[PDB]
Design a binder for this molecule. Structure first.
Ligand SMILES: C=C1C[C@]23C[C@H]1CC[C@H]2[C@@]12CC[C@H](O)[C@@](C)(C(=O)O1)[C@H]2[C@@H]3C(=O)O
Length: 323
């Protein structure tokens, strides 16, 4: 059973998003922006956390929201003691939501309380207007920006202790940014993936079994992939299916340790677990948290055991991977 408040909240998204996707693959963008629930940044702490909006790349208008316990502070000296910086990529299937979306503002606030660190939430460019690889470009831009701020740095070796994190499409983005980091010898302390979004041309058992049962449909999954991938591409494109027929194994790369959180009632759970399996197979460290009773979005409402469990696993993983 889905708790009633989760059911109501996620259904509200499901039904609204139904009217925004057009049959021709275009999107009701102005209406989507108008209907999204969002909050401003606020320098004044709410429950001990403050937030600040900042453009980090003027060429593409790329903005982030920075959260910390409580503008000029970015200049501040590297902290004596280590702290995590979590670079967060919101969900919404490459198409929806924003760093200002209340569900994500609230999650980032909770991440700061939980990590005693800093959260940088990236307003990546969205599909269908901006297709592959724009969102990945923006996450790489954000990683490099974070690494270069004195404030973000900490510990003996005064460096940014960066974790890449995201749910849904943002978890996909986190992965691809992490791969690029490993290719370029940029150190990432860990990836935190919540229901990371992956796909492929064939359906898995979970996809066929859970289709339409828990807010998500294959029609809509196919729609979002079509919206993000190049016009001539299919779901076996490596952005979508990083270890499928057109994929690339990651053996030998200095790849991040991964905490991989999977909802058992997310119809794509099979792919997330096979993703984890492939990382392990490539010699990388993976911790998988399977939340068998959880639907998509469970980490958004503090109303299930899985919610509490996962916040604790996140805290443990951060602590374990900081020093
Ligand atoms: C069309 C969509 C997009 C969904 C799934 C389906 C219905 C509910 C949506 C959200 C809406 C709330 C969260 O952003 C989200 C991450 C979540 O938990 O549910 C979204 C999810 C996704 O982008 O993967």
């Amino acid at each position: 059973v889905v708790p009633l408040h989760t059911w109501v909240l996620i259904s509200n998204f499901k039904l609204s998003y139904n009217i925004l996707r057009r049959a021709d693959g275009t999107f009701e963008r102005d209406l989507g922006e108008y209907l999204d629930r969002r909050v401003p940044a606020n320098a004044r702490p709410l429950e001990g956390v403050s937030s600040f909006d900042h453009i980090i790349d003027q060429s593409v208008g790329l903005e982030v929201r920075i959260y910390r316990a409580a503008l000029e502070f970015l200049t501040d000296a590297p902290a004596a003691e280590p702290f995590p910086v979590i670079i967060f990529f919101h969900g919404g299937s490459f198409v929806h939501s924003s760093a200002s979306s209340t569900i994500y503002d609230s999650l980032c606030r909770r991440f700061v309380k939980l990590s005693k660190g800093v959260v940088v939430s990236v307003n990546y460019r969205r599909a269908p207007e901006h297709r592959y690889p724009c969102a990945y470009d923006d996450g790489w831009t954000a990683l490099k920006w974070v690494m270069s701020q004195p404030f973000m740095r900490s510990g003996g070796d005064a460096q940014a202790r960066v974790f890449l994190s995201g749910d849904s499409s943002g978890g996909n983005i986190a992965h691809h940014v992490a791969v690029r980091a490993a290719d370029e010898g940029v150190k990432v302390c860990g990836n935190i993936l919540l229901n990371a979004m992956f796909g492929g041309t064939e359906r898995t058992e979970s996809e066929r079994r859970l289709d339409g049962k828990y807010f998500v449909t294959l029609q809509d999954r196919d729609w979002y992939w079509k919206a993000y991938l190049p016009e001539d591409a299919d779901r076996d494109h490596p952005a979508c299916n990083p270890f499928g027929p057109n994929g690339r194994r990651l053996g030998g790369l200095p790849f991040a340790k991964s905490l991989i959180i999977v909802s058992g009632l997310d119809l794509t759970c099979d792919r997330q677990l096979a993703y984890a399996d492939a990382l392990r197979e490539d010699g990388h460290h993976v911790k998988v948290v399977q939340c068998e009773n959880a639907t998509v979005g469970f980490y958004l409402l503090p109303n299930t055991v899985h919610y509490h469990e996962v916040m604790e696993e996140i805290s443990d993983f951060l602590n374990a991977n900081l020093y």
